[PDB]
Amino acid sequence: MTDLRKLEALQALHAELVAVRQHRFEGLQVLETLLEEQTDAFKALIAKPARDTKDREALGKEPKKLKIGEEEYSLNEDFVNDCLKLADELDLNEKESARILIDCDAEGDVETQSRPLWECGVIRFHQERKYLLDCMRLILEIAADEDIDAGLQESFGVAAEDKIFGIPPPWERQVKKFIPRCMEAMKGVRSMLQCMADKANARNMLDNQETLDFSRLSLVEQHECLASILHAAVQRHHATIADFQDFIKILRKWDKYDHFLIHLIPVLAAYITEFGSPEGMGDLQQARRLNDFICSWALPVLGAAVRAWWIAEHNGFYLDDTVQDLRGINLDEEDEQRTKQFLDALKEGAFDFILSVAADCKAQEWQDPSQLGARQWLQRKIPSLPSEPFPFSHFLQHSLMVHLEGFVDATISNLPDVLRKLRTEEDEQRQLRPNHEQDMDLERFLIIISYAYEGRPDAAMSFWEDPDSNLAGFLQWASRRASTPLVSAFCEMLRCLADNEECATAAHNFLLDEQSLTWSQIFKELEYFTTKVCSEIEPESALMLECYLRLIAKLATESEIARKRLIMDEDFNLVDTILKLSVGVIPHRLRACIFYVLKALMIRKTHEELDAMWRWVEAWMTNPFPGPQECMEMMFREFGTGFEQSNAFIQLLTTLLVPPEGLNDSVPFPEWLGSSIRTLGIEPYVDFVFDVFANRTKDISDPSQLRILRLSCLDFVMVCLVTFNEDLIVLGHESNISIDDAMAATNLATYVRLHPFSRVMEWLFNEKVITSLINTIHQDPISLGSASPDSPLVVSILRAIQVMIKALELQETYLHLVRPEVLRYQGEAGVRRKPVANAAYSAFEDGILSHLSLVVDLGKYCNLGHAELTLACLKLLEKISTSSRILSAWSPRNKAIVQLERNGEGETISASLSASIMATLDPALAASGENYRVKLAILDFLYACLRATPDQPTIAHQLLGFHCELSKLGIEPKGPFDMQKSLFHSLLNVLITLTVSEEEQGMRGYLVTLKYRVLRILQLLWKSPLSASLVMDELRATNFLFHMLLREVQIQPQLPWDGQLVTGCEFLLSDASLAYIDYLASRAAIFEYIGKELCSVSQNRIPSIKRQIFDALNGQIFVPLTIPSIFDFFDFINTDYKWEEIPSPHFTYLKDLDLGPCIGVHYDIRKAQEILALKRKEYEHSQLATPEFLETVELEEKVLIEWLTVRNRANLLLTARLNLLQAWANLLLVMIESNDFKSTPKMAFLLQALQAILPTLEAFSSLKSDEAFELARVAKVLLWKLEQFTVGNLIGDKLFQLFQLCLSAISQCSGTPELRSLYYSICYRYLTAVVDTRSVTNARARTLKAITLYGDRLLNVICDDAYGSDTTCQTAAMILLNALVHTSRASVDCPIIDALNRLNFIGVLVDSLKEILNEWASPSQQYTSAKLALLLQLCQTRQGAKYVLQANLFRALEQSGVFVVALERHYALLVALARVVGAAVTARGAHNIVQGRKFLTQHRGLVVHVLKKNAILAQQALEERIEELAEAFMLLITATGFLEYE
Amino acid sequence: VDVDTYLSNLQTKTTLSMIADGLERSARDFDAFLEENVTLEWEAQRKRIYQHFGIK
Amino acid sequence: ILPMYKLSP
């Protein structure tokens, strides 16, 4: 927004500063605009107006109307009470306090936090100071950044001088300085925090605990920000002596040790650096007074440290006598004074306090177990922190380390003799009284140096660049003969000074000889201790050994030359010594250190190193000095006691299981591992690991140790599983023994038998494993909420979910291709193995179907925000819902629905899902946005849950907001789904508020995929009749179709897809085809939904919505907003792209390789890849120009793969277009049929649709028989459901053109008999209604020309359709011939009837007359009607008697023996036959009368009954036939002349 | 009642109407032809001769 | 009941 309040203004400003700090200058113009609006804010850091009585008495006197600035508000008895409460707790003015509360009502944060209104005012007030002060730190921090443009770096600099420090810029120019305001500002924070504890403790001695904690956190953060701002200001030389004296006095008056002192430490450091050191106010005379002033204290260690720092920084003046004046001043006296002062400071515990502060500063919640007990063996007498949750920042730590390294450099370059005398004193003290422990001054100083130089290689390199400098001098001097503590401190310093590889190599080269410490003495002492332990040990020796091991491990992990040298050095043999030491009686720390050293040495290894390591392990585990099978298990159990050595043993195994090539054949271990002794190879290791992880997980009290052990075990299991070949084993079991030879079979057999995957799978079927897993996953939510994203619990849960997924994926492959082979091998050969699997658990689901809280925990873990964990949980739930045994056990009433409805878990899960899907995405990180990934995962989960078992409800229905009942659903009153606030409504909202039409790219892909998934879910929900009526009601109650139509977009060949054009050849190869298919499916689904809704509204007989539907279809909207009509969207049918045609390359080779085994049109690429590979191998074996012609085969394969992909994409596009065309045709049919509106207005749309389909039919007249069907039936019904002169011409014109394409298809016999039948009906009514008055003659004349154009070719096809297999085609074809002969006579002869005789149609037609009784509403009855009806027409023309009489029809009707509603049909047949015979005799003349007399004489009597009969509805119909039948014979009598015969 | 059966019912009704129209047109054509053939002459004599010959 | 579902652009 633009009109943001104070809070929203600071929050938005903070985000902008982070952008510039994170190398994002996209908000430069927007940043400057904010500093000008908040100018008054930066002026005053923090200032709360004092509580005045004028407002207190006035607020409560008339609490009716309040006026703040320009706006006005109304006060009520409820809101007024919150103002007085907020003002009292914070002692803030009533006017200012009211404004804070008003900001909450407007923003409406009471619901976002669900807390009292008066409490929100306290949070809102603290937020202002947070950003107001925190943002200032970013300005100065960015103004000092050297990795940015010099211009921008200076802009923020001058701005801070005026906005923060109130100093105008150089181009311009009673007020108070910045420091005095900052000092008073921080003072208020202390007094406010002190009074807070006093008042809070009084009432405490509630729902506001978390609010008080957050307020304390905000206060400490604001204090840290103010301290950093003060430090930065002092760094610009903007201080004086008064401020220094005030700070010194405040320090002297310090009462308790807390984080505030640690924050102020750097302030005093910078003060002494600017004043004490010769790098600032270089007034030598002024420094003399400060020396006596510094040299009352309620804590002597503080004064000692201050004096030590001051001496160290001020001893730099007395180095030379040329850069300054030192006349008339003695040096030895001052030197002795400073020396005694420094000694007193040391004795008081200066270095001790410095070390304690450095340790408490970097206090980490979790530490790596590889450095336990390091730098924690001193005597700390300083009290520790209260352990309150006050974490430190990063800039503070950086500044502290910089100041410590500077102090170290100063003390090393200024006071070397002091350190020398101190070391000599400590040495002589330890010598004259060894029983006592001398001071640890030098050790503490070295530890402080190490802490200062940590993770800063830029500074550590200084100790190696110049070997003749003071730093290298001290480094080499501190390596001479000394005691164990000093050697340990030096080793720790070296280890911490190896943050990179260059420093590690430098330390390696400096340690070995090129006296100082050397590897020779180290290994000599190691061997001495080994022989002593093996034939007690003091803590100093153990500490020295641990330090040596840590240093060796660090050097091996950081350096490469040392790792390659020590591993194969003949003079050292470190491996033998460490092994002989580990096999001895020593604590677990040494064993863990040795294991970590081994891991570091084996971090990067090769085949030879792996073989040597396995050989040594086998030699030392087979006879460790008792049979081997017993000694190995004894050693394993010995290494199982505790956690450090176990984790350490486990990490080593995991690292050894990694191949040298990195993370497929050559399993990473020797095939002959354990072949000498009767052992199963590497199985014992995994067996022991699983036994430990299953049984000894209860002896770990420290939760962190248990979590670390579980994480290590999960990582080991994953490293063991990921190293198993699946496709390789599948192809082996498929073709190796059946097709390939039996040579490689042994390799696969050995691989399957030696790989530990089988043992891991067998262990997975144990109850202990799944119980431990579900116990680890079942944890309280508060822990995960307060934990850090890098917490070990989250990582362990993720690893466990991944292991479960891998197990569920590979269980089938295992049970298929592992168990039988292993069983056969065990039966054939001799193997002794103990089963650890449960036969009852036939699958992995049997062991987990007994846990109901698993799904609840997985659903609750979705509100954490972790992308990886959320995706893993969603995938796990999807796989669970996709199974069958789980849903068969749950719903054999049900258990999941009642488990998720215990304490409203479903409601909160749905709310979290809604809040998540509503979260926007990052346009730049389209495919990388974790939010979009979570959305797609949720959509896939819902799709899989709805597609599986749609008839029976599932958890998806409950999550959508439905009342899942047994074989029934429903909605509850006031529920989440009733108030239109649920997951389904959220999906509807995010769908209707989604725009795909873009400008920079246009027609994006991931938006298309999202909407396609949403539409698929909607279709799955609709098709399900159990959740169809309510869904349709909720959709029609919100006008969803209207939103969809408004969101529609037109498609054209100009708009590119993701910046790529459609006509490009790469389009078929790119991914735009998927988006195009998705858009086609979306349009089809929308059309289907619109048609269904229109049909529903029509059958409901309510015109309230029909008007709006038609208006939307007409192109107008009355809320007028216009939209493209349905005819506009008919732009997807285009043959210019030529999706059917494909350019076939030459393919001079591999032409005979067909796609037989490749082929649901899906041509597999591997089926042809294997064939072409075999052919290439055969050609190479032929030894005929194999090297040259190889590139030809390679490029032919690279072309064939793309050919196959293009064919698949073309098939997909074709089927998508077919589905879309079918949906559009169905929609158009439903629209035309159900339409009560007038037809004369819709004639325009009718003509438009005709014009649009004309080219479609002309282009697909004989190409394919699938698209014409949908377009052939729509034209049929349209022709029957039928200024005026202009319209009459266009209609008749297209009806004539449409008549041509029909006869053209009939002449070629295209399509199936079904499509061929529709063409008959179209031409039927055209020749019966349109043609049947100069206009009529022209149409009739030209119409006959088209029929004569084809000739016998056309009639031959129609004659064959009759008396065929199909029932409707033969009927339409028979009736069609009637119209042809009928219209031809109107134009004494006819060419149509003549053609029928030449084609032998009349002959076979008269033959079918026999057995007519068998054939004769019913389909067979109506067919015969058209048959006899046709013959009657031919007997009317004079020429027909000739051809008809020659067919001998008199003998055909005799073999058949044919001569209230049922009777009527009987006479109908006799009439039809009588008319054919009656008209035939009277057609030619006296040549047929001879036959007529025989018919009447041979069948006499029957006609007499009819002629005498003639002489309610069904009765009249029956009598009518009698009249026609009676009159039929009468015509034959008078025409034949039977009266003359008498 | 349902969209799937709606189009089937429409096609069935169209086919029935087409068959009925064809039958009616054929009947009308036959009636017109018979009327044109009988209106030439001897409208009542053709039946009177038979009524006199056969039993009334 | 329809605060945002209205067709009021």
From Swiss-Prot, chain A:
Which GO CC terms are listed, alphabetically? nuclear pore inner ring
Instruction: Specify whether Nucleus is a keyword of the entry.
Output: yes
Give a single Pfam family match.
Answer: Nup192
Q: Which GO terms describe its molecular function?
A: structural constituent of nuclear pore
Provide the protein's localization.
Answer: Nucleus, Nuclear pore complex
Q: Name one GO biological process term.
A: protein transport
Kindly report the protein's main subcellular placement as a broad class. nucleus
Q: Which UniProt keywords apply?
A: mRNA transport, Nuclear pore complex, Nucleus, Protein transport, Translocation, Transport
Q: Which PANTHER family match?
A: NUCLEAR PORE COMPLEX PROTEIN NUP205
Summarizing the function annotation, the protein's role is: Functions as a component of the nuclear pore complex (NPC). NPC components, collectively referred to as nucleoporins (NUPs), can play the role of both NPC structural components and of docking or interaction partners for transiently associated nuclear transport factors. NUP192 is located to the NPC core at the nuclear membrane and is essential for de novo assembly of NPCs.
Assembly mode: Component of the nuclear pore complex (NPC). NPC constitutes the exclusive means of nucleocytoplasmic transport. NPCs allow the passive diffusion of ions and small molecules and the active, nuclear transport receptor-mediated bidirectional transport of macromolecules such as proteins, RNAs, ribonucleoparticles (RNPs), and ribosomal subunits across the nuclear envelope. Due to its 8-fold rotational symmetry, all subunits are present with 8 copies or multiples thereof. Part of a tetrameric NUP192-NUP170-NIC96-NUP53 module.
Which protein family is named in the record?
A: Belongs to the NUP186/NUP192/NUP205 family.
Name of the featured protein = Nucleoporin NUP192
> Where does this protein come from, organism-wise?
Chaetomium thermophilum (strain DSM 1495 / CBS 144.50 / IMI 039719) (Thermochaetoides thermophila)
Q: Which gene encodes it?
A: NUP192
UniProtKB/Swiss-Prot annotation, chain B:
Superkingdom as given in the UniProt entry:
Eukaryota
Q: What is this protein called?
A: Nucleoporin NIC96
**Which organism was this protein described from?**
Chaetomium thermophilum (strain DSM 1495 / CBS 144.50 / IMI 039719) (Thermochaetoides thermophila)
Subunit info here reads: Component of the nuclear pore complex (NPC). NPC constitutes the exclusive means of nucleocytoplasmic transport. NPCs allow the passive diffusion of ions and small molecules and the active, nuclear transport receptor-mediated bidirectional transport of macromolecules such as proteins, RNAs, ribonucleoparticles (RNPs), and ribosomal subunits across the nuclear envelope. Due to its 8-fold rotational symmetry, all subunits are present with 8 copies or multiples thereof. Part of a tetrameric NUP192-NUP170-NIC96-NUP53 or NUP188-NUP170-NIC96-NUP53 module.
| Compartments (UniProt record) | Nucleus, Nuclear pore complex; Nucleus membrane
Member of which family?
A: Belongs to the nucleoporin interacting component (NIC) family.
Q: What does this protein do?
A: Functions as a component of the nuclear pore complex (NPC). NPC components, collectively referred to as nucleoporins (NUPs), can play the role of both NPC structural components and of docking or interaction partners for transiently associated nuclear transport factors. NIC96, which is localized to the core of the NPC and the distal ring of the nuclear basket, is required for de novo assembly of NPCs.
Swiss-Prot record, chain C:
Coiled coil regions, renumbered to chain? none
Q: How does it sit in the membrane?
A: Peripheral membrane protein
- State where the protein is found: Nucleus, Nuclear pore complex; Nucleus membrane
Name of the protein in question = Nucleoporin NUP145N
Q: Which organism is it from?
A: Chaetomium thermophilum (strain DSM 1495 / CBS 144.50 / IMI 039719)
- Specify first residue, last residue and whole-protein length for the fragment: 630 to 638 of 1793
